[PDB]
From a paper:
The structures reveal a homotetrameric enzyme in which each of the four active sites consists of a pentacoordinated iron protoporphyrin IX prosthetic group with a tyrosin­ate axial ligand. The heme is deeply buried inside the protein, with a complex network of channels providing access to the exterior. We have previously shown that in addition to [name] activity, the [name] from S. thermophilum ([name]) possesses a promiscuous phenolic oxidase activity in the absence of hydrogen peroxide.
Specifically, the variants P158W, H246W, Q293W, I313F, I314F, E316F, E316H, L321A, V536A and [name] were constructed.
Author numbering:
A (entry chain D), B (entry chain A): 21 to 698
C (entry chain B): 21 to 472
The structure:
């Protein structure tokens, strides 16, 4: 409905050309009934031409993603820190559009690739569109925008054969990481659970760069944007993410779409760390450096307002595919900093839309339009939709009475550069020495994970580096990892049969910080939307009756329940043939269905051992599992799952079963089921 | 109207970016007051990017042109001959847009080049956009669309140096004409006054091709479109066209704009010749052949309705430059014929818009939009401005209830191919023998011109062919001209010092037809809008008083009056410095200004002899000229203009002068002032 | 090779701009060591501009695929059935490029999706480029090219949310299949092991359409192309295909690349079924119908020659991504039929390259160039890489002595339409009744599989 003016309804009417002539489109015009097709068939050509030209270039990065509409609401009048209009009153509402994404994969690649994730937010403010183009990880791989093609060439598929898709698990990527040590911080994040988030709803957003808040009196402060998930933080496990990439490439976009449709639209607190200009170098690193984070212990979050996504697009292409974000879409009250990564981005995103749109009027696309008047002397270009009345589009003029008027700090609520900003020194292509510590913060991050999380990170590196063919690259990787942590280097080296280099303790330390750990962020605050598969059978009416009773009790608490059986009928959502443990956050077997879990169990209706495999996979991936009905021993024995296990449930009573099971869904993952290096 | 919704008003307000953020655009952001410009200046880059991308490819032909809005009104219910909805009721009104053009010149070439002219009309009908993409000449140079690049390459500038602009007066064009005899008919028309019309308003429009009118019962007839000017036919003379190309390259577009602004918007009767399918070959040629005309003596005109242009565009680029005509834009009640020129056009115009627009959604540009709902399954593409609600865009479907429905002869007022049409025979790349007479109709045309018009045509050929460097091409040209008329070939040969080949009488004849002659079409039916220059002086109060008196009497009758003097003041529109005879349809000298017309007359305010030259040029070019307000033999003697001449006026009385002079403006051209062969 | 001249070696030397000026590309130019980046940094902007414009529109179908170079060798002089030059002598070798693909998925989608597969072969013949743009299944879903967007919209992701990727397992696809019964034959093939081949090497190629072989004397025969794998036929099982789509999205392109690198480049016998014009309707269906196959029991294969793929590309983008196939790339000795599916394709492939390339000169891309001289009056356009010497590019001319000369049946080894072809009847948008049996051949196919 925010873009309702542009909607086209095709629920009634006769087929027309694009110029409104009624036509048909099902048979070609031919010279006789078995004859050749005629060139004069305009119905054919207009239709096929349109089809032939449907595609546009995918985004150069973040090609794979999905979007939704929502609302931002301010929690206060923030005039005291920023002139930004959308923040100027308690309760003030601004429409938003958000797109989430991976980075490296092409447009049909799997959502559950291991990657950095995009989190791009447009605020359609009453003083212009404002975009915060962020990621789910607070730090970036490189310290200068000029290096971006080098990073991206290295992580994208090898350019002779275009292998591998959507993965850093190849020689070129690890060559780059090992030769460019700035990469270490983002690399540790990507190799953690933050690389495989459970959903877009269960990840945070970060602006990464230091920006400025600028007041109407001209004074400024330095800020970092943090969008903090109200759904909690959660990750997949890698082995799960891999199967899920095959069983459901669309998992994150389906999860988001479904949450919105069920009235469970995700929320984030839009927050900032705010510090003085004088603190640019007070925290032990440079705030211009996008590889560094300010620990919350040094600078607490201020909650500015609520972001809620609650409406899905009408047409994916027109809205999600065509949305064209820019950090140059800035409003009065915000300003840039001299972060050399940010500085270069400002060029890139204005330029790249020429590629995507194929012409310069991409801001006139519905999803890109602002919600306030446009007054400027920009004219013409391919695809020009406006018919400008002002026939004197130059400044200065008298023939249009000096309009449009110039807007600045003192008139017309103009954008203005923070007036205390200066530059000094030589014009240089040199890196600030203040940027040179690439290893301390990677170590702070590693130190801040729980022991099982540290093991998962080590295991991601063991997985990826084991697939690097070059022994020289592997050696170089261990050299870099060793500068962060000797223990990481030793543990990774053991999987690839190299020796780790001797400890180099220059950057070793034991400091920790709060809020980076997924495992350590406590049970989820809500289990609404989490998926429960109930494994049943049509061969026992009692099994379907147990399943119906469980359904009622679980749906009441907002869980999405799937009853699985051999064949569809009323009460049964999915067959075993299409079911997989990657489809559920918890698995329940009804004890009327125990016969399906025997080793002699076979059916033409699903793959051999599928029922048991679902249960076993769920258990092994750390999910809450259980048997409901009181006869648990046949299922749990076939699965080799101990009755006494944490996150294993066995109760006769449906109500008792569900109460226990729901504590398990909040715990989310039972990390005791993962072996640790000694 | 799609146009009104996209109008943008910039008569008030502060400058904004394209996303509504208020900004400035007059100074670059710099590192210090004398410092380098910053990459983070998004104000700079968005403005310059837009500027950098303002241009689009000019049309491949008809690049130079001008457009206006109007209305078409049907004179009757034409159901008895066509199902076309815009013709279905007396008084039914349909909005139109017309673009007029030359063919060969690039976008900034002169209006008054010698060329064929475009006359392209869009009817925004209640059953879809219908375009008649015509010319001011009823026949085309070639008989097969596949030859169009050959024609166009030959007439456009030579591709090594891109010389000459907007002219057929070079070897390649005459080589093509001489080797491709089909060209002879259109060549004679372009070499007549039809090549240099006085204005877009003083020329007719022709669809050229035979089309079909198709009734709702399925029966069809063959038609030719003729748009007959209500302003009359008028031409420049060549020497005038040449000076005018330099003094005012915008002459025809200015004329059109001014006529509309003064409430003199031009009108045409939209007419057809209508004949039976059985007459395809009855008139001595093939109605599928686009080098042939049906003489009105064999098939008279039926007036279908009135076309009036009465509103100028708001933005030239958005409306005139972007309008994208297609003969594929057809409506129920009209059909194509197997004219091989027409057949190929249908392909070209859909394809070429991809070039111009850079993307497939060019029908969404306001000027291209229809005025009825669009219901189809065309999706995506660069520049997609719609948000389609229908998420099952395929036929056949049940998930969108089978909508959109197919439209055809029987339902939904669908377009349908005339059901009587057939094809028979081999699949061939062969020209019909019925097309082979390239010379009889050029002769009919030449025979139908008056003696002075025949001389102007001979003189245009003498001019152009004298500029052909190759003696072989010149010989080849005479061979072809000789097949039309031995007399033409003899008379043209005399100017280039070759002998004409012996008479070859195979195609010679003495037949004539009405309605092709400009000179023979009698006085103009109105003199409104015609331009009178009054040559006066500031050195005599009496001269300005004579000028004012004449002004009053001429403006009363809707003439556009310019008083010329040495310097501007109240009552004086233009200086001698800026004045030229090409600016006027008639020239009057006031008796009090006689001193300026002496040979010793000199001034720092205008070139030597300018006043007299204007008068003499006007006389020489056949225009009504006179001296008003005494016994006024001094100006006529200085100019060597005889008082007794036709179109020369000499009166003391303002009233008597104006009454005589206005009959001269209606006569328009005094052809007795041009010498004839023998 | 048009490619050899365009190879660029970067194994030595200093970084340069695209105009040969030595530069650096690792740090932005800034006003001071902690200062803002300067607009005057041309090194920055040229590098980022290039990066920002690296992507081009993926193909509208068959976006997911991979290619290799090879050679075709004729087994005989086939003059007795076709004038085609690449078939005119025993042992005659023609370079080829082949791209294999899925249909429905986007770039980055998994190789082991269940789908129809593309098998597109370019023969760079000594009389022009000849493309056979085929699939691994011999029949197509629809009987008229105007329906193609309907088919493709139905099988591609639902357009509100773009779910699901690379799959017909959703409502819209099965709605279309159930409402358009022509789809049954190809549906059965796609739902068999032919939908999930073990590799590109283990599947066959088919032209699908009936074409014509035309002799120099003007006589013609009807043909069907079958490229028969020398590696044998093999399929995945579905449960395996699903896991493989997650564990190795690059499975088929890796398999092909590896086989070529190890000296096991895949081979096919390029074969035809050949029948007389008079047999258009002899086999119990219409040979103009692309939902029908001629049983080999009625028309046996003739082996024409050997196709071998034996060299991987140097640059995927420049070769594989940019190769632009067209059924309009036809040579003397081959002609079309009035198959309404084929007829419409001829339009689509010329048009769609404007989308991909962004300009009209896509035949000048090295991978698209022929291996013979080009002589025509095509001029200008964005990205014009030639400098044409002929300054009179029109026919007829005397100023360039009538060159280039027209080629036809009796001149310059011109292409010519088979001269026995005719058309007759009303100009109609009507389906031939001869196309109406949508179910017998699906049943023949099902009957011909083993019980498992
Ligand atoms: C100098 C080049 C460059 C650099 C250094 C970056 N990016 Fe970027 N980014 C691009 C150049 C770019 C781009 C090529 O301009 C893209 C591709 C599509 C588009 O619209 O912008 C893009 C897309 C893009 C999107 C997808 C937006 C959407 O959903 O459409 C996200 C979330 C980001 N980027 C986030 C970042 C973050 C958080 C960065 C570092 C802090 C970052 N990028 C650095
Ligand atoms: C096979 C190609 C071809 C052939 C045989 C013709 N033309 Fe055409 N014409 C074009 C290819 C074309 C074009 C390249 O497609 C243009 C350029 C811009 C456009 O929209 O279409 C065009 C533009 C064009 C315009 C300008 C429309 C405007 O103002 O925007 C007119 C008036 C004509 N043509 C009229 C004719 C007439 C009366 C023809 C013969 C009866 C003719 N053309 C044959
Ligand atoms: C009317 C449109 C239409 C129809 C009926 C078809 N296709 Fe097609 N096909 C296209 C329109 C198209 C296209 C849009 O024009 C593509 C996409 C990009 C390109 O080069 O052409 C294409 C690509 C394409 C490719 C990929 C070539 C490559 O690897 O680059 C193959 C293998 C085929 N198709 C095969 C077929 C077969 C065997 C068909 C039926 C027998 C068929 N197509 C019908
Ligand atoms: Ca690699
Ligand atoms: Ca984790
Ligand atoms: Ca373009
Ligand atoms: Ca020339
Ligand atoms: Ca029809
Ligand atoms: Ca669907
Ligand atoms: Ca199989
Ligand atoms: Ca032919």
């Amino acid at each position: 409905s925010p873009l309702a003016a542009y909607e086209v309804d095709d629920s009634t009417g006769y087929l027309t050309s694009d110029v409104g002539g009624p036509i048909q489109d099902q048979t070609s015009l031919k010279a006789g009934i078995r004859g050749p097709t005629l060139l004069e068939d305009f119905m054919f050509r207009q239709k096929i031409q349109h089809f032939d030209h449907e595609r546009v270039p995918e985004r150069a990065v973040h090609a794979r993603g999905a979007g939704a509409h929502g609302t931002f609401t301010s929690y206060a009048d923030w005039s005291n820190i920023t002139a930004a209009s959308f923040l100027n009153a308690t309760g003030k509402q601004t429409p938003v559009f958000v797109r989430f994404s991976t980075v490296a994969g092409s447009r049909g690649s799997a959502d559950t690739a291991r990657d950095v994730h995009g989190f791009a937010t447009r605020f359609y403010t009453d003083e212009g569109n404002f975009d915060i183009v962020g990621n789910n990880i607070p730090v970036f791989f490189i310290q200068d925008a000029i290096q971006f093609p080098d990073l991206i060439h290295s992580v994208k598929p090898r350019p002779d054969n275009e292998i591998p898709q959507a993965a850093t698990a190849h020689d070129s990527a690890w060559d780059f990481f090992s030769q460019q040590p700035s990469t270490m911080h983002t690399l540790f994040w990507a190799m953690s659970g933050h690389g495989i988030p459970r959903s877009y709803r269960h990840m945070d957003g970060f602006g990464v760069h230091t920006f400025r808040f600028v007041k109407d009196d001209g004074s400024s402060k330095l800020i970092k944007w943090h969008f903090k998930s109200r759904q909690g933080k959660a990750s997949l496990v890698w082995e799960e993410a891999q199967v899920l990439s095959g069983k459901n490439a669309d998992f994150h976009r389906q999860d988001l779409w479904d949450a919105i449709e069920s009235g469970n639209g995700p929320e984030w607190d839009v927050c900032v760390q705010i510090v003085d200009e004088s603190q640019a170098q007070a925290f032990g690193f440079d705030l211009l450096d996008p590889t560094k984070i300010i620990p919350e212990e040094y600078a607490p979050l201020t909650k500015l307002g609520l972001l809620k996504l609650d409406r899905n697009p009408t047409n994916y292409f027109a809205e999600t595919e065509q949305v064209m974000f820019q950090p140059g879409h800035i409003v009065r009250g915000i300003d840039f900093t001299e972060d050399p990564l940010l500085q270069g981005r400002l060029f890139s995103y204005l330029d790249t839309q020429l590629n995507r749109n194929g012409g310069p009027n991409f801001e006139q696309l519905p999803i890109n339009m602002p919600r306030v008047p446009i007054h400027n002397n920009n004219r013409d270009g391919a695809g020009q939709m406006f018919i400008h009345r002002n026939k004197y589009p130059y400044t200065p003029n008298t023939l249009n009475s000096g309009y449009p008027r110039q807007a600045n700090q003192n008139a017309g609520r103009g954008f203005f550069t923070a007036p205390g900003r200066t530059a000094s020194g030589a014009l240089v292509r040199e890196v600030s020495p203040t940027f040179n510590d690439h290893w301390s913060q990677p170590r702070l991050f590693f130190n801040s994970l729980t022991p099982v999380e540290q093991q998962f990170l080590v295991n991601a590196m063991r997985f990826e580096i084991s697939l690097v063919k070059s022994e020289e690259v592997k050696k170089n990787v261990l050299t870099q990892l060793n500068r962060v942590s000797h223990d990481v280097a030793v543990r990774v080296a053991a999987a690839i049969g190299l020796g780790a280099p001797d400890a180099d303790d220059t950057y070793y330390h034991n400091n920790k910080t709060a809020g980076w750990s997924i495992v350590g962020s406590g049970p989820l605050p809500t289990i609404k939307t989490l998926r429960v598969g109930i494994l049943a059978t049509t061969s026992e009416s009692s099994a379907l009756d147990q399943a119906a009773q469980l359904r009622t009790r679980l749906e009441k608490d907002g869980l999405v329940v799937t009853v699985v059986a051999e064949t569809l009928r009323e009460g049964v959502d999915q067959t075993y043939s299409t079911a997989d443990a990657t489809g559920f956050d918890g698995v329940v077997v009804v004890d009327g269905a125990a016969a399906l879990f025997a080793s002699t169990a076979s059916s033409p209706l699903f793959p051999t051992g599928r029922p048991l495999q679902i249960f076993v996979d769920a258990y092994r991936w750390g999910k809450p599992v259980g048997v409901c009905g009181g006869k648990s021993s046949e299922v749990l024995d076939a699965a080799d799952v101990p009755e006494d296990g944490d996150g294993v449930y066995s109760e006769e009573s449906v109500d008792m079963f569900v109460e226990e099971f729901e504590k398990g869904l909040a715990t989310f993952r039972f990390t005791d089921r993962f072996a640790l290096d000694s």
